[PDB]
Design an enzyme around this catalytic site. Structure first.
Site, PDB file in Angstrom:
ATOM      1  N   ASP A  35     -12.441 -45.858   7.782  1.00 45.75           N
ATOM      2  CA  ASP A  35     -13.555 -46.623   8.316  1.00 45.75           C
ATOM      3  C   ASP A  35     -13.862 -46.202   9.746  1.00 45.75           C
ATOM      4  O   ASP A  35     -13.206 -46.652  10.681  1.00 45.75           O
ATOM      5  CB  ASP A  35     -13.209 -48.118   8.279  1.00 45.75           C
ATOM      6  CG  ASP A  35     -14.313 -48.993   8.812  1.00 45.75           C
ATOM      7  OD1 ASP A  35     -15.436 -48.482   8.970  1.00 45.75           O
ATOM      8  OD2 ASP A  35     -14.044 -50.198   9.038  1.00 45.75           O
ATOM      9  N   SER A 199     -30.737 -41.104  16.227  1.00 47.68           N
ATOM     10  CA  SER A 199     -31.530 -40.270  15.344  1.00 47.68           C
ATOM     11  C   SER A 199     -32.919 -40.061  15.937  1.00 47.68           C
ATOM     12  O   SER A 199     -33.454 -40.929  16.624  1.00 47.68           O
ATOM     13  CB  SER A 199     -31.619 -40.916  13.954  1.00 47.68           C
ATOM     14  OG  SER A 199     -32.517 -40.232  13.097  1.00 47.68           O
TER      15      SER A 199
END
EC number: 3.4.23.22
Length: 330
Positions: A35, A199
């Protein structure tokens, strides 16, 4: 040193991925959920409330000659989906894919929430976010990666998740045969303890690319792709009959649909998520309403590039002094 381990979807939907991990002496192999959005290595154990164990493999520290109680240490964690676990702490030897750390904090669960109990395939979590998020008190502990880092050939790990197939976590090296083209690297903020990046935009299907900054986290421990409501609405508008269902808890679409791809930007580069990666199947057995793999982050408080996005790429988690993230197509 290096390590290399195969990671395997837990079910036919790629709801999560499990990776075998050796703990203790002699080794006890548990299948952990790696994770990159948390920083605790915790396991089902001989100390876990018996009614809360249902098929998981447990760690038994009393059977490990290298286990030592970390006296006075406790831990307690809650995840974004409302699940949680807590317990006490041992140090022991932990190996992943041939890479060994001695003295790793192994957090033994005394209590786990129902969602963990109900998932028989996941024996615990191995956190790979920054150690500043580790929940052990009163002495915070380091992640497996942080402990291994100085010994690694290069201070990196890579995630290569499969679509409906196994994939690979590598530590200490970049497998140049595992991706196509070049890796594009992008800046990381560690301010919130995550692999947080920006992004450069998105496209829906064959549509034009929208240049827009989207801050979010690279999180292997989250199944879906959670993005701003504007972006998500633009995606689902291209699927006839798709709608947001408050009763179901997100966007659903007719199972008869063919889903468009979704592209996200990494600098000037582009990662394309095929439409099929966005299908999470019937909302309930036999239903013709299917659950979408791109959902709104509104009310999460952060955008999450979860498995839906990451499995479309070869992803480098660069833990150099100034961390960065790399993405390549594959």
């Amino acid at each position: 040193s290096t390590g290399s381990a195969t990671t395997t979807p837990i079910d036919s939907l790629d709801d999560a991925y499990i990776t075998p991990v050796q703990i203790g002496t002699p080794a006890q192999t548990l299948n952990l959920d790696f994770d990159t959005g948390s920083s605790d290595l915790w396991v089902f154990s001989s100390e876990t409330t018996a009614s809360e164990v249902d098929g998981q493999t447990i760690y038994t520290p009393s059977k490990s000659t290298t286990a030592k109680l970390l006296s006075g240490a406790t831990w307690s964690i809650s995840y974004g989906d409302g699940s949680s676990s807590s317990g006490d702490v041992y140090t022991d030897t932990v190996s992943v894919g041939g890479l060994t750390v001695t003295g790793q904090a192994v957090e033994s669960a005394k209590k786990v929430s129902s969602s963990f109990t109900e998932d028989s395939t996941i024996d615990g979590l191995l956190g790979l976010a920054f150690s500043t998020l580790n929940t052990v008190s009163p002495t915070q502990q380091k992640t497996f990666f942080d402990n291994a880092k100085a010994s690694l050939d290069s201070p990196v790990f890579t995630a290569d998740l499969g679509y409906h197939a196994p994939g690979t976590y590598n530590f200490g090296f970049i497998d140049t045969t595992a991706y196509t083209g070049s890796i594009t690297y992008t800046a990381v903020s560690t301010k919130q303890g995550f692999w947080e990046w920006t992004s450069t935009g998105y496209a829906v299907g064959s549509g034009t690319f929208k240049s827009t900054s989207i801050d979010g986290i690279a999180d292997t421990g989250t199944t879906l792709l959670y993005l701003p409501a504007t972006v998500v609405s633009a995606y689902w508008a291209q699927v006839s009959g798709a709608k947001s269902s408050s009763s179901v808890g997100g966007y659903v679409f007719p199972c008869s649909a063919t889903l468009p791809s979704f592209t996200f930007g990494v600098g000037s580069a582009r990662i394309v998520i095929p439409g099929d990666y966005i299908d999470f199947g019937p909302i309930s057995t036999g239903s013709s309403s299917c659950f979408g793999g791109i959902q709104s982050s509104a009310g999460i408080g952060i955008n999450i590039f979860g498995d839906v996005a990451l499995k479309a790429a070869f992803v480098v988690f660069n833990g150099a002094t100034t961390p960065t993230l790399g993405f390549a197509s594959k």
